[PDB]
Write a protein that binds this ligand. Structure first.
Ligand SMILES: [Cu+2]
Ligand SMILES: [Cu+2]
Ligand SMILES: [Cu+2]
Ligand code: NA
Lengths: 128, 128
């Protein structure tokens, strides 16, 4: 199994994937985010944020409260398993995390915390 | 002996759990849905409908258009892995499905298809 995934967020507020499977043989897993299109970060910025499904709402809400300067993410949010920077068009960011941070049979979600974006920019991650 | 879950939908349009883990050893899994509370089926009816995460939106949208008499579910919808009937207060219904219909490292959701309910009445199902 590949221990990485490449994901795009675009100018239509979409990710190009909404499911990630992480094989238990991976020690680490890398998410490579990019932003095709031409809208800048202050209007259409995207991140990739990974938490338990149960933690997503608090992460998203506290991210909105943290504002654009903090990449719409609460600093040192302990619920965040992995995060990229908030990127604008033509940029890219990668995050690597330890697969040991994923428990078996637990539900994970990934999402963008730019306000409003998680309506569409969300997806599910499991172990395999 | 642990191949079932009890779930409730109430008058506030809430399930009492949003995460189900199915033991990979179970041949069959049973969901026992009940409706505590006081509102009838045509106002606050609930079902338990299981699909892949990817299929939830289409099941929900097509169910809305099917109407109350068809339990707000498209007939013979091949995306539905398991469904209870739509129940009103005091009523109960169970569904048993084959665990073979679930795959590892794949994302399932359960939800109610009564119109509007799935924004609140939804949850994630995984294998352990
Ligand atoms: Cu975004
Ligand atoms: Cu979900
Ligand atoms: Cu309902
Ligand atoms: Na591999």
């Amino acid at each position: 199994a590949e221990c990485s995934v490449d994901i795009q967020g675009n100018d239509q507020m979409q990710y190009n994937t909404n499911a990630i499977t992480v094989d238990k043989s991976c020690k680490q897993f890398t998410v490579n985010l990019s932003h095709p299109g031409n809208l800048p970060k202050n209007v259409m910025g995207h991140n990739f944020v990974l938490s338990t499904a149960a933690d997503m709402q608090g992460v998203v809400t506290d991210g909105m409260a943290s504002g654009l300067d903090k990449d719409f993410l609460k600093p040192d949010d302990s619920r965040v398993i992995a995060q990229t920077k908030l990127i604008g068009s033509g940029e890219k960011d990668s995050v690597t995390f330890d697969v040991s941070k994923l428990k078996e049979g637990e539900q994970f979600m990934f999402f963008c915390t730019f306000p409003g974006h998680s309506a569409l920019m969300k997806g599910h991650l499991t172990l395999k």
